[PDB]
Design an enzyme around this catalytic site. Structure first.
Site, mmCIF file in Angstrom:
data_model
loop_
_atom_site.group_PDB
_atom_site.id
_atom_site.type_symbol
_atom_site.label_atom_id
_atom_site.label_comp_id
_atom_site.label_asym_id
_atom_site.label_seq_id
_atom_site.Cartn_x
_atom_site.Cartn_y
_atom_site.Cartn_z
ATOM 1 N N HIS A 68 12.644 29.172 11.818
ATOM 2 C CA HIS A 68 13.967 29.146 11.133
ATOM 3 C C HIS A 68 14.560 27.731 11.163
ATOM 4 C CE1 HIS A 68 13.589 33.560 11.725
ATOM 5 N NE2 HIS A 68 14.083 33.526 10.492
ATOM 6 N N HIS A 72 11.869 25.706 6.434
ATOM 7 C CA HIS A 72 12.047 27.076 5.894
ATOM 8 C C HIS A 72 13.133 27.054 4.814
ATOM 9 C CE1 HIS A 72 12.594 31.432 5.783
ATOM 10 N NE2 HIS A 72 13.868 31.263 6.088
ATOM 11 N N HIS A 106 20.881 29.315 3.849
ATOM 12 C CA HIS A 106 20.884 30.763 4.173
ATOM 13 C C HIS A 106 20.591 30.995 5.660
ATOM 14 C CE1 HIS A 106 16.539 30.604 4.081
ATOM 15 N NE2 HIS A 106 16.552 31.812 4.662
ATOM 16 N N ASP A 107 20.008 30.035 6.383
ATOM 17 C CA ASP A 107 19.681 30.215 7.834
ATOM 18 C C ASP A 107 20.320 29.091 8.676
ATOM 19 O OD1 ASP A 107 18.194 32.714 8.315
ATOM 20 O OD2 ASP A 107 16.336 31.757 7.662
ATOM 21 N N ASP A 217 13.093 34.549 0.697
ATOM 22 C CA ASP A 217 13.105 34.504 2.174
ATOM 23 C C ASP A 217 11.734 34.838 2.755
ATOM 24 O OD1 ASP A 217 14.280 33.915 4.504
ATOM 25 O OD2 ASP A 217 15.348 35.832 4.713
ATOM 26 N N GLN A 269 1.068 42.955 10.926
ATOM 27 C CA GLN A 269 1.222 42.267 9.614
ATOM 28 C C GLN A 269 0.928 43.264 8.482
ATOM 29 O OE1 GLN A 269 2.271 38.808 8.590
ATOM 30 N NE2 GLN A 269 3.303 39.586 10.401
HETATM 31 C C1 LIG Z 1 9.733 36.264 9.080
HETATM 32 N N1 LIG Z 1 9.967 37.692 9.116
HETATM 33 N N2 LIG Z 1 11.194 38.224 8.999
HETATM 34 C C2 LIG Z 1 11.116 39.528 9.418
HETATM 35 C C3 LIG Z 1 9.738 39.847 9.753
HETATM 36 C C4 LIG Z 1 9.183 41.087 10.314
HETATM 37 O O1 LIG Z 1 9.944 42.016 10.696
HETATM 38 N N3 LIG Z 1 7.754 41.100 10.361
HETATM 39 C C5 LIG Z 1 6.981 42.007 11.130
HETATM 40 C C6 LIG Z 1 7.385 43.431 11.036
HETATM 41 C C7 LIG Z 1 6.765 44.378 11.817
HETATM 42 N N4 LIG Z 1 5.796 43.966 12.697
HETATM 43 C C8 LIG Z 1 5.167 44.576 13.808
HETATM 44 C C9 LIG Z 1 4.273 43.594 14.322
HETATM 45 C C10 LIG Z 1 3.444 43.725 15.505
HETATM 46 C C11 LIG Z 1 2.750 42.607 16.005
HETATM 47 C C12 LIG Z 1 1.960 42.727 17.147
HETATM 48 C C13 LIG Z 1 1.842 43.971 17.778
HETATM 49 C C14 LIG Z 1 2.521 45.080 17.269
HETATM 50 C C15 LIG Z 1 3.329 44.970 16.135
HETATM 51 N N5 LIG Z 1 4.246 42.439 13.521
HETATM 52 C C16 LIG Z 1 5.299 42.577 12.629
HETATM 53 N N6 LIG Z 1 5.941 41.584 11.882
HETATM 54 C C17 LIG Z 1 9.006 38.705 9.381
HETATM 55 C C18 LIG Z 1 7.531 38.516 9.290
HETATM 56 O O2 LIG Z 1 6.689 39.090 10.043
HETATM 57 N N7 LIG Z 1 7.227 37.615 8.304
HETATM 58 C C19 LIG Z 1 5.918 37.325 7.701
HETATM 59 C C20 LIG Z 1 6.729 36.795 6.453
HETATM 60 C C21 LIG Z 1 8.056 37.170 7.150
HETATM 61 MG MG LIG Z 2 18.054 34.762 8.182
HETATM 62 ZN ZN LIG Z 3 15.339 32.837 6.158
#
Ligand SMILES: Cn1ncc(C(=O)Nc2ccn3cc(-c4ccccc4)nc3n2)c1C(=O)N1CCC1
Ligand SMILES: [Mg+2]
Ligand SMILES: [Zn+2]
Length: 313
Positions: A68, A72, A106-107, A217, A269
């Site tokens: 952030h 970004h 925005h951040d 975003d 992911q």
């Molecule tokens: C930056 N951004 N803003 C919000 C979120 C988000 O919630 N992403 C997440 C959501 C759920 N997940 C669970 C697990 C996870 C990992 C390891 C073990 C168990 C579970 N990995 C996850 N990543 C993101 C993001 O990932 N990116 C990529 C582009 C934005």
């Molecule tokens: Mg934000």
């Molecule tokens: Zn952002």
């Protein structure tokens, strides 16, 4: 007045494409943003003296966090630039002005922690803003910078145009709160399918700008695989720091934030692409057809994460 920014040939061409990476040269990022404002908005939109001073005050108020950060901000502003350029006649002069600045701001002053960590920590911001905590703070910081002597890039707008642009920026920045994204897209999905979606209805434009803000975003997932993969490291570096800080408060963090469960990142992911990113760019593509390359890149990257799990990378 007759002073354009120009980029080297490779950047001049690639900058027009959704999947452009702004590069590792920090000192080029301000010029890349001004370039994008001049072509999207006009060379007259902003006094260059005031824009340059606004840009550098915004830069100063991003922190040196893994994700952030100032990089970004500029990345998210470029995605918005690509959407606006590929959708020329759909947006008012005021919307083009407001949305590039909204994305850049925005951040502002992000600390690398989620709204949930602020609330469990009991941070003063959580008492000042009960919902969309960081996002209300980011807009607060935007208005503060605009009110510094010589930093008011909107000074040559009429009183009502000024109030409208700040309203566009406020809704735009609030929409980057991902907790609000789910309901926003469901409503936009229903409106598109029942045929009630009307871009002359202000409440409808608001929802569409909100989805655009979510799309910009999240635009890390729409880059070429090597950019997407290396950005994932920065993203998880923040998540795991936050997970560490949850454990210091005596709270087991969610697996997404627990550095002991790195193994599960590929499946995590996958969930994120299916639950958030693909639905986001699908609805965006239905409303604004020329944004399809974003949905296509997101699918390519979904397929790349599937390959990681199958042990193939
Ligand atoms: C930056 N951004 N803003 C919000 C979120 C988000 O919630 N992403 C997440 C959501 C759920 N997940 C669970 C697990 C996870 C990992 C390891 C073990 C168990 C579970 N990995 C996850 N990543 C993101 C993001 O990932 N990116 C990529 C582009 C934005
Ligand atoms: Mg934000
Ligand atoms: Zn952002």
């Amino acid at each position: 007045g007759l002073m354009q920014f120009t980029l080297p040939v490779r950047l001049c061409k690639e900058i027009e494409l959704f999947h452009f990476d702004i590069g590792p040269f920090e000192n080029m990022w301000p010029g890349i943003f001004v370039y994008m404002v001049h072509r999207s908005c006009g060379t007259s939109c902003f006094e260059l003296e005031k824009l340059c001073r606004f840009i550098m005050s915004v830069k100063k108020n991003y922190r040196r966090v893994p994700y952030h950060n100032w990089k970004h901000a500029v990345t998210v502003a470029h995605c918005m630039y690509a959407i606006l350029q590929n959708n020329h006649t759909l947006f008012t002069d005021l919307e083009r002005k407001g949305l590039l600045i909204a994305c850049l701001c925005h951040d502002l002053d992000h600390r690398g922690f989620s709204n949930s960590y602020l609330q469990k920590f009991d941070h003063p911001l959580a008492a000042l803003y009960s919902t969309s905590t960081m996002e209300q703070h980011h807009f607060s910081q935007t208005v503060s910078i605009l009110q510094l002597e010589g930093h008011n890039i909107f000074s040559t707008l009429s009183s009502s145009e000024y109030e409208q642009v700040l309203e566009i920026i406020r809704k735009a920045i609030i929409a980057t709160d991902l907790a609000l994204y789910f309901g926003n897209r469901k409503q936009l999905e229903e409106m598109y399918q029942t045929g009630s979606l009307n871009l002359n209805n202000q409440s409808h434009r608001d929802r569409v700008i909100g989805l655009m803000m979510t799309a910009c975003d999240l635009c890390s997932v729409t880059k070429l695989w090597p950019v997407t993969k290396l950005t994932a490291n920065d993203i998880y570096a923040e998540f795991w720091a936050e997970g560490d800080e949850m454990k210091k408060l005596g709270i087991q963090p969610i697996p997404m934030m627990d550095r002991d469960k790195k193994d599960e990142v590929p499946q995590g992911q996958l969930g994120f692409y299916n639950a958030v990113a693909i639905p986001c760019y699908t609805t965006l593509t239905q409303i604004l057809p020329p944004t399809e390359p974003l949905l296509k890149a997101c699918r390519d990257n979904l397929s790349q994460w599937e390959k990681v799990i199958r042990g193939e990378e």
